[PDB]
Design a protein around this nucleic acid. Structure first.
Lengths: 49, 110, 195, 49, 48
DNA sequence: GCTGCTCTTCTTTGCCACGGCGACTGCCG
RNA sequence: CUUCGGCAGGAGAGGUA
DNA sequence: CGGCAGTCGCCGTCTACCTCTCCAAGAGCAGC
């Protein structure tokens, strides 16, 4: 869906290519870890945040 | 599952003590939080009359709590009327440093 | 207990890390009770007890292999027993393959546990092999084991008293002449740092 | 919002069948905030006459 | 600021004189260092 | 159980320009 | 020659040249 | 190993004068 809708400009498709993120799990955890360094990486408190 | 140190206020050790209990009953934490012994000193205040012997905290500001793990525990014990935080930030606090394997008895005995 | 003046630690540049050759982050960790530091070492006992130490370690190391193969074999035995009961023919070999793979996986995790053990022991060893003054240890378990088993003939602490002990043994002349030599010969950013 | 915290805290300390609305409300923060705003503030000013 | 310094110094002194575990005295020493730093230059590190 | 004296301040929501210079620190090559 | 006895820090807002 | 470039943290930002108001609280612990 993201590549069907947000795909009329090379900006979006090029940012999509170099994303390196695949899986809402991986993504969510990446941001969870990012926000606060060195913290308990429980997915419950991630969806909470 | 072992013992942990908790920081209170100077003047709220027994209010915290009572609160932790009342809260352990007014929430539903009888399968998590366990005994909460604030180290006490029964130093007989000799008076030959009206006696003024009291708790006279040995560690003004700290209260020892025997709890379980997880995070709910943490939240309930920290958000109590009269506490200041935890004790054990010897490296991020990820694994809150517990009292050395054999150290509880050295306080509970006396 | 001793403390530290804020002017000579939090300034730019930090006049304490310029003297002890420590990064200011390490100073912030040591002073505010967040990491241990190695105040002094002694290579006398170290070199005069290498063989002995290594041998004693190896002796404890062998126990791991012992237990390892003990459970390994006992597993193999019971596994092949239940294979003779219901895996030699097509009685119920369907999920019996998974059954015996159960204990094969438990033997794989037995090897993973021998890995874990030998690994952490290797850590301890490599640590005690280097042990140089002014080296930070961030993990509490490593330092606790080091001071429990190899505590003597080595010292470490944390706080402002540790900084005081580090300054106590500091030899000004040697560091001054080393800096002057680096300035005289040797190019790059080392020139600027030595200046 | 300040008084709500005391109201919420007081529910885990008293006992049911003894909890009364006149026992959970502390009206001190509200009057303190009102008095602090109407005096000693940057927008309530001494009148020009 | 002098009052805070004296308070945490007499607390640390009593804890030490009785013989408390290492973690409590370490926390007290950290707090005393922070108080002294606030006395000399308030706001340099952390919150004022 | 009276009122004056005395002592003390950490989770939980608050938080709010612009140029110059130098240290530094992961980070790529 | 005159015995005791009697004071003045911060924060905010608005103005003048 | 060896450059290296973004980034962040600390420094500075005109002189003299006049008028007004406001400056912790909450909870525990006495000696009767």
């Amino acid at each position: 869906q993201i590549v069907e809708r947000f795909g009329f400009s090379e900006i979006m498709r090029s940012t999509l290519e170099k994303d390196n993120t695949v899986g809402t799990d991986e993504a969510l955890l990446d941001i969870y870890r990012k926000l606060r360094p060195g913290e308990p990486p429980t997915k419950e408190s991630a969806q909470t945040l | 599952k072992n013992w942990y140190v908790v920081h209170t206020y100077s003047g709220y050790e027994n209010k915290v003590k009572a609160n932790l209990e009342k809260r352990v009953e007014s929430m539903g934490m009888q399968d998590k939080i366990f005994r909460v012994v604030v180290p006490e000193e029964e130093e007989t205040d000799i008076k030959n009359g009206k006696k003024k012997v009291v708790k006279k905290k040995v560690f003004p500001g700290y209260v020892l709590v025997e709890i379980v793990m997880t995070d709910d525990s943490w939240y309930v014990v920290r958000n109590t009327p009269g506490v200041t935080g935890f004790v054990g930030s010897a490296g991020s606090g990820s694994k809150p440093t517990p009292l050395l394997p054999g150290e509880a008895e050295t306080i509970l005995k006396r | 207990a001793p403390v530290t003046h804020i002017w000579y630690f939090k300034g730019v540049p930090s006049r304490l890390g310029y003297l002890l050759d420590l990064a200011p982050k390490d100073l912030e960790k040591i002073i505010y009770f967040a990491a241990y530091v190695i105040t002094s070492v002694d290579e006398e006992m170290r070199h005069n007890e290498l063989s002995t130490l290594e041998a004693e370690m190896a002796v404890e190391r062998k126990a791991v292999e012992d237990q390892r193969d003990g459970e390994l074999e006992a597993r193999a035995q019971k596994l092949e027993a239940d294979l003779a009961e219901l895996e030699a023919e097509g009685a119920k070999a369907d999920a019996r393959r998974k059954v015996r793979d159960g204990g094969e996986r438990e033997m794989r995790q037995i090897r993973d546990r021998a890995q874990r053990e030998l690994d952490r022991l290797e850590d301890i060893w490599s640590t005690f092999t280097k042990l140089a003054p002014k080296q930070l240890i961030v993990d509490e378990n490593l330092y606790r084991e080091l001071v429990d088993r190899y505590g003597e003939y080595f010292t470490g602490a944390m706080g402002a008293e540790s900084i005081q002990k580090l300054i106590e043994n500091f030899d000004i002349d040697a560091e001054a002449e080393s800096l002057r030599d680096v300035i005289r010969n040797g190019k790059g950013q080392k020139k600027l740092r030595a200046l | 919002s300040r008084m709500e915290r005391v109201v919420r805290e007081r529910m885990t300390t008293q006992d049911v069948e003894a909890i009364t609305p006149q026992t959970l409300i502390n009206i001190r923060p509200v009057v303190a905030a009102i008095k602090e705003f109407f005096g000693t503030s940057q927008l309530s000013q001494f009148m020009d006459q | 600021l002098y009052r805070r310094v004296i308070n945490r110094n007499n607390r640390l002194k009593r804890l030490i004189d009785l013989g408390a575990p290492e973690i409590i005295v370490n926390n007290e020493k950290r707090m005393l260092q922070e108080s002294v730093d606030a006395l000399f230059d308030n706001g340099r590190r952390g919150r004022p």
